Amino acid sequence: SGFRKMAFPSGKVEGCMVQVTCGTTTLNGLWLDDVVYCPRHVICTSEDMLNPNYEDLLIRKSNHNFLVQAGNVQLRVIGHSMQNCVLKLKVDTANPKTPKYKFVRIQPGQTFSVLACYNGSPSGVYQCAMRPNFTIKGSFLNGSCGSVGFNIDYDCVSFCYMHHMELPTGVHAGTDLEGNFYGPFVDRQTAQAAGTDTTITVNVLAWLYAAVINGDRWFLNRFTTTLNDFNLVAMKYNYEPLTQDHVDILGPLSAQTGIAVLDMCASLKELLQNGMNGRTILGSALLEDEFTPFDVVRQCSGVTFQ
Amino acid sequence: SGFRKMAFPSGKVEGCMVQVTCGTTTLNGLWLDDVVYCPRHVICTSEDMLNPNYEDLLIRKSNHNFLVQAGNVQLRVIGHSMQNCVLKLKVDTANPKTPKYKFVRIQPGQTFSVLACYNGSPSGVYQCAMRPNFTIKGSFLNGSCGSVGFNIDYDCVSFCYMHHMELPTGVHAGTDLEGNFYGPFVDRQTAQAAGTDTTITVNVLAWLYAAVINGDRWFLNRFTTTLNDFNLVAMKYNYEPLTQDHVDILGPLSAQTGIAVLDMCASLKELLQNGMNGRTILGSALLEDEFTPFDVVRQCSGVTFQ
Numbered sequence: 305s306g307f308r309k310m311a312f313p314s315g316k317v318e319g320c321m322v323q324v325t326c327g328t329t330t331l332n333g334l335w336l337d338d339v340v341y342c343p344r345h346v347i348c349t350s351e352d353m354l355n356p357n358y359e360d361l362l363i364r365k366s367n368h369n370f371l372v373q374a375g376n377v378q379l380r381v382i383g384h385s386m387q388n389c390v391l392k393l394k395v396d397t398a399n400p401k402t403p404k405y406k407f408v409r410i411q412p413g414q415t416f417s418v419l420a421c422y423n424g425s426p427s428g429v430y431q432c433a434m435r436p437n438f439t440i441k442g443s444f445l446n447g448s449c450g451s452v453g454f455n456i457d458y459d460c461v462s463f464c465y466m467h468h469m470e471l472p473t474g475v476h477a478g479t480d481l482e483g484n485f486y487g488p489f490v491d492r493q494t495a496q497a498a499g500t501d502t503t504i505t506v507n508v509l510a511w512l513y514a515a516v517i518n519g520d521r522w523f524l525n526r527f528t529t530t531l532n533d534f535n536l537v538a539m540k541y542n543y544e545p546l547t548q549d550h551v552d553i554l555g556p557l558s559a560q561t562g563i564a565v566l567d568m569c570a571s572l573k574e575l576l577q578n579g580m581n582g583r584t585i586l587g588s589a590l591l592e593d594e595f596t597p598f599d600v601v602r603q604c605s606g607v608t609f610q
Numbered sequence: 611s612g613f614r615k616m617a618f619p620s621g622k623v624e625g626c627m628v629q630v631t632c633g634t635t636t637l638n639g640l641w642l643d644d645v646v647y648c649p650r651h652v653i654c655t656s657e658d659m660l661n662p663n664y665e666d667l668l669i670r671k672s673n674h675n676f677l678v679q680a681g682n683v684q685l686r687v688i689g690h691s692m693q694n695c696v697l698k699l700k701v702d703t704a705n706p707k708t709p710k711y712k713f714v715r716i717q718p719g720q721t722f723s724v725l726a727c728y729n730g731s732p733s734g735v736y737q738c739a740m741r742p743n744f745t746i747k748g749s750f751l752n753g754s755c756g757s758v759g760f761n762i763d764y765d766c767v768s769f770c771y772m773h774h775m776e777l778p779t780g781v782h783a784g785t786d787l788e789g790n791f792y793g794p795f796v797d798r799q800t801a802q803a804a805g806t807d808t809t810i811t812v813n814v815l816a817w818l819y820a821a822v823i824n825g826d827r828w829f830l831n832r833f834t835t836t837l838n839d840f841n842l843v844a845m846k847y848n849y850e851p852l853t854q855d856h857v858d859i860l861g862p863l864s865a866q867t868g869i870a871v872l873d874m875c876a877s878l879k880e881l882l883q884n885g886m887n888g889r890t891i892l893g894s895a896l897l898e899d900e901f902t903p904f905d906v907v908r909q910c911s912g913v914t915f916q
């Protein structure tokens with residue numbers, strides 16, 4: 305038993321992290337087969353990141369302007385190209401540690417692991433959710449650009465995020481691995497800001513089920529509610545709507561605990577209207593929304609990856 | 611910016627996890643050079659784990675009773691011995707992925723990463739603290755026995771924990787890698803229970819400094835307090851005493867934020883006596899005590915590992 309914010313083992317991704325240097329700019333790259341992927345703003349200087357023309361900036365570069373370090377070993381760049389907001393540096397060596405991988409774009413509400421990296425060297429690993437407003441509440445310092453987020457399915461790494469920037473509220477914005485930003489952000493220095501967020505309702509319900517699985521039951525009650533009547537309450541507390549597909553996705557957790565989904569909604573309703581009155585749920589005094597139904601089943605049932 | 615419960619990259623440890631089978635019992639082992647380390651209760655059956663004589667049980671085994679699987683490759687056991695509560699299985703192959711490592715025993719209050727494992731296959735990674743009562747609040751299911759906890763210092767893995775059992779309150783107990791239990795627990799089925807816990811005061815102060823570094827300042831005040839007067843308050847809320855060495859360890863964080871340690875203690879005092887009155891600190895509605903001063907400096911400053 306127990307319940308923790310648990311990331312995927314990071315080793316398959318550690319073997320892909322490299323350091324990319326263009327001029328005085330150093331950040332992280334992702335080395336898969338003979339390609340290194342990195343934020344295109346590596347080609348920008350201080351005054352460039354103001355209002356840059358990336359096509360103009362890139363035509364002025366040569367392969368030799370890109371130094372790629374795989375540990376203490378230098379990779380010769382033999383081609384370069386721009387794909388949306390990412391650079392693709394073709395190198396002469398395929399990475400012998402390339403795992404089986406995919407590039408997948410995730411949905412707000414889904415979770416992933418982040419291997420935070422500096423100078424191509426992994427620093428730490430932690431679990432993140434894509435917020436409804438397409439930001440992530442990460443932990444990133446200067447030089448973390450190019451760190452990636454991912455999920456693992458058996459032996460296959462699904463890369464979903466590459467870190468680009470921090471927004472003024474301290475939250476983080478980035479792209480998928482095709483270079484397409486999550487949300488309405490750009491790789492220039494503007495006054496861009498996050499924009500309003502909501503709480504991921506289906507995830508809170510999953511975490512309440514995780515709590516019941518782990519023996520926290522004080523918040524349960526005999527009442528039920530309808531989906532419409534619950535969604536009226538969710539609106540008022542800035543929770544996003546619950547759909548029938550959410551109810552269906554919560555089916556297995558419902559059947560394992562014997563608590564109907566709509567009964568759990570009644571419990572959530574009471575918690576929103578009354579607070580928790582000095583008690584905790586799974587060691588939190590807040591309603592936690594960064595565990596998906598899958599995360600709960602994975603952790604409370606025990607699936608590994610190889 | 612941002613602040614997350616962040617584990618060490620796990621790859622150096624992933625390469626050491628193996629599966630150990632004795633009879634019908636399967637658990638995880640740690641393969642370093644030509645030795646596999648695992649809980650000695652692998653040699654016990656259902657009726658054995660009641661009141662076992664491990665020396666009697668082990669003399670009845672042969673090398674061939676131990677099947678060790680390193681992935682889809684079987685390791686031939688060529689010797690076995692007991693060291694306290696762990697088994698040492700000598701195998702004919704040294705692990706080519708052996709990192710530079712040490713066996714270190716940690717103190718209550720210190721943190722480490724856990725690579726949760728099942729059938730020798732890593733499942734997830736997360737950060738844990740050693741509680742003052744020598745338990746850990748982990749996330750472990752049946753079959754996680756033998757999963758290890760560790761820290762990484764540059765390129766060196768300091769192994770500090772091997773998981774053995776879950777206690778009746780859902781918390782976890784285990785040994786260091788010499789087989790010596792943390793706390794007053796035994797690898798038999800008794801009515802053993804955790805015993806009373808306290809909050810790690812110096813860690814809460816470190817996390818308050820992390821919050822200030824990250825722009826949460828609402829809990830700051832102009833008052834100060836003395837070390838004696840603070841420790842009177844800590845006693846009353848089940849916090850453990852703060853010492854002058856704790857104050858010294860908090861020195862760098864004090865100087866970076868310009869908030870005297872004893873001023874932060876005044877803030878903590880106010881938070882204990884008043885609660886947080888609907889506000890949060892670093893996304894928590896509770897005072898968080900599982901970040902050390904080192905964890906805060908590492909994350910808010912950016913040290914990597916290679």
Ligand SMILES: *[C@@H](CC(=O)OC)C(=O)N(c1ccccc1)c1cncc(Cl)c1
Pocket residue numbers: 329330331345346444445446447448449468469470611
């Ligand atoms: C990367 C900055 C870079 O490539 O130069 C070393 C970086 O990590 N940045 C960043 C992005 C945009 C503009 C300046 C700096 C970053 C990312 N996350 C958080 C923070 Cl504080 C900075």
Ligand SMILES: *[C@@H](CC(=O)OC)C(=O)N(c1ccccc1)c1cncc(Cl)c1
Pocket residue numbers: 305635636637651652750751752753754755774775776
């Ligand atoms: C390991 C049990 C084992 O070796 O048999 C497969 C295990 O993970 N155990 C455990 C320990 C002691 C007695 C029974 C089972 C365990 C550890 N942590 C949590 C839980 Cl729920 C069980």
